[PDB]
Design a protein around this ligand. Structure first.
Ligand SMILES: NC(=O)c1ccc[n+]([C@@H]2O[C@H](COP(=O)([O-])OP(=O)(O)OC[C@H]3O[C@@H](n4cnc5c(N)ncnc54)[C@H](O)[C@@H]3O)[C@@H](O)[C@H]2O)c1
Ligand SMILES: NC(=O)c1ccc[n+]([C@@H]2O[C@H](COP(=O)([O-])OP(=O)(O)OC[C@H]3O[C@@H](n4cnc5c(N)ncnc54)[C@H](O)[C@@H]3O)[C@@H](O)[C@H]2O)c1
Ligand SMILES: O=c1ccn([C@@H]2O[C@H](COP(=O)(O)OP(=O)(O)O[C@H]3O[C@H](CO)[C@@H](O)[C@H](O)[C@H]3O)[C@@H](O)[C@H]2O)c(=O)[nH]1
Ligand SMILES: O=c1ccn([C@@H]2O[C@H](COP(=O)(O)OP(=O)(O)O[C@H]3O[C@H](CO)[C@@H](O)[C@H](O)[C@H]3O)[C@@H](O)[C@H]2O)c(=O)[nH]1
Lengths: 312, 312
């Protein structure tokens, strides 16, 4: 099939691009390099089944782009991804994450696109949820502008589905980690710990370091995108995670074990917008998509540390 | 108290301004005259308790404005209001209704505003709902971009409530009508019918004319706004309607009776984006706010026709 990936120059996006090409699809990648990296795509230079478009989803002529390339499925990964940034500038986060999504949907509905696969935020959209692990039936309750914009994106796509019959599904990942995640990003703790511990630079947790997340490996997340791209799970959100909680402190220890050396992070003040706990019920993805994560944290961390070590 | 009304030059906005002034408040009205009219406020020219600011919520320095005027309550009525327009240009609708709301919330949380009263759309946010009359407990299921943006607005304000403790409640009206509603557009059917029939100009219904809405008089909606402006019903949405369905055909008959004119509408094609039925369960507003609509359709329609007959 023909696929278009927004945020294609990014961590998850470039990984998804590689997977789709392997699966025999032709791919158009779209990115403005806000946080993505050309090196994530540089190996594709001579592949005729791949075309890259440098474009900003907020302002670009998405209608013209989609009219040219006629993607059957659009995988929408382009976003402002930093929670703290969204607090600093909710307007900008909303422009990229809400307006960008709306413009893409409006383009897609006019150009024969079959389905948009949205990227929500399983890790943040439920806010402080009524239970853990958190199922998709739990109400959204965002507590950061980033989380709100992701919810708004889902709703707008659901709307276009009613309005025009433009199919959509929402991939809602937990905390994604692995190769190609920006070591110099403001977010992505696994990458941050790995890079710093390899370099012997200081590491820090926030609060008492008890804050928990659900750490899911990139290759597993990519598989979920592929599964949901077919005519299945239409109209629905799927939590994509492991259903296992790992504290800031516990993760540090695991990364230290993989790198070697000391396991002694600093403790810094909590950050406004960040939730205390995150753990996803992944039953729906199993039942409906046949999706299950293959990579356990210890293995994923080893893989990620090794990757960083080699590239370092 | 100090109050600021966005959309103050509009139909509901100007009516609310009048009420707030009568209740002894100082009022700042804010509008860009996208759909509002200076004539709706011209009677206030010599009232020292009223100040008007011309500003576009999408781009104006709202922080500066709130820092100057220091409202305790912001009544947020500024919006793109036309469902079909939202279908024709979802980006523009999203810019005004989502981005505008986000910017206002970001301004308000910085200037010591106690509460924002949002205006949602009870009539559209539920889409095709599970039951009629529809309670607030029914899931939102928007089927127009306008409805989606109203839902997104709610969610962002709920987010700012978590983030900063900026209080919010969502007034979610059904179909509001009465004096000052503009008769010259495609929205505001009661006004359209009333002025056209008085003028002997053609009228029309859409589809088979059986579509229903819940018609609630402007003064009733204004009272709900005032009631919810106190520290009451924090974090909640309130359906503001009558809980009675009137079809397009029945409405036309009602307006024709009030005017004393012919009841012979043309029949035009359906409008994409328009729901078939809309009816609100108003129990929650009664319980929490002590609010009930006083004005029955027959009486409200009479008062609406009179507005056009007495108009300067
Ligand atoms: N990494 C995680 O833990 C995680 C978990 C849940 C959700 N997500 C979502 O997954 C998606 C991919 O995130 P990631 O982890 O790969 O981060 P990333 O920053 O590597 O990927 C985001 C990509 O979007 C691009 N982009 C940003 N704004 C753009 C714009 N206006 N126009 C065009 N392109 C733009 C960036 O340049 C980047 O390449 C995002 O939607 C993110 O919100 C990530
Ligand atoms: N009329 C109804 O049936 C009804 C019911 C439910 C919801 N609402 C909501 O009630 C509010 C008022 O609607 P109305 O019926 O009075 O219509 P209206 O068009 O008279 O009022 C909207 C006002 O907002 C102003 N405005 C629009 N965009 C603006 C911007 N970018 N910056 C500043 N001002 C801007 C317009 O100029 C106008 O004065 C809106 O939020 C609308 O969505 C209306
Ligand atoms: O130096 C650091 C950085 C982070 N953390 C902790 O690591 C966790 C994860 O933080 P971060 O890597 O910044 O990710 P999140 O803010 O949780 O959000 C990520 O995971 C979400 C999952 O839904 C995505 O939506 C977001 O885009 C993505 O940035 C938190 O508990 C932080 O306190 C540390 O202890 N030390
Ligand atoms: O010439 C006309 C115009 C409208 N209608 C009918 O009247 C009804 C009401 O339509 P309209 O006045 O355009 O309002 P809505 O599209 O229902 O939306 C209104 O009511 C919502 C209630 O929440 C608000 O959110 C919106 O801002 C407001 O425009 C519909 O069934 C139309 O078919 C006619 O029969 N003839």
């Amino acid at each position: 099939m023909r696929a278009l990936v927004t945020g294609a120059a990014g961590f998850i996006g470039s990984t998804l691009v590689d997977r789709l090409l392997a699966d025999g699809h032709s791919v158009v990648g779209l990115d403005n390099f806000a946080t993505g990296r050309a090196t994530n795509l540089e190996h594709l230079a001579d592949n005729s089944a791949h075309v890259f478009v440098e474009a900003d989803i907020v302002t670009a002529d998405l209608h013209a782009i989609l009219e040219q390339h006629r993607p059957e499925v659009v995988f929408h990964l382009a976003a402002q991804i930093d929670v703290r940034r969204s607090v600093a500038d909710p307007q900008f986060d909303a422009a990229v994450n809400v307006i960008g999504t709306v413009r893409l949907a409006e383009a897609a509905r006019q150009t024969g696109v079959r389905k948009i696969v949205h990227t929500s935020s399983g890790g943040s959209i439920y806010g402080t949820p009524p239970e853990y692990p958190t199922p998709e039936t739990a109400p959204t309750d965002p507590a950061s502008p980033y989380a709100a914009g992701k919810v708004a994106g889902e709703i707008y796509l659901n709307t276009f589905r009613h309005l025009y019959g433009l199919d959509c599904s929402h991939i809602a990942p937990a905390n994604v980690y692995g190769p190609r995640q920006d070591p110099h990003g403001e977010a992505g703790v696994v990458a941050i710990f790995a890079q710093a511990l390899l370099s012997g630079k200081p590491t820090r947790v926030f609060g008492d370091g008890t804050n928990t997340r659900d750490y899911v490996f990139v290759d597993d997340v990519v598989d979920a995108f592929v599964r949901v791209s077919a005519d299945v799970g239409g109209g629905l959100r799927f939590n994509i995670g492991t259903g296992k909680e790992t504290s800031d402190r516990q993760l540090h220890s695991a990364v230290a074990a993989a790198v070697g050396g000391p396991d002694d992070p600093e403790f810094h003040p909590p950050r406004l917008g960040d939730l205390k706990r995150s753990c996803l019920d992944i039953g729906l993805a199993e039942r409906v998509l046949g999706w299950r994560p293959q990579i356990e944290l210890a293995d994923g961390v080893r893989r990620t540390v090794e990757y960083f070590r080699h590239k370092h």
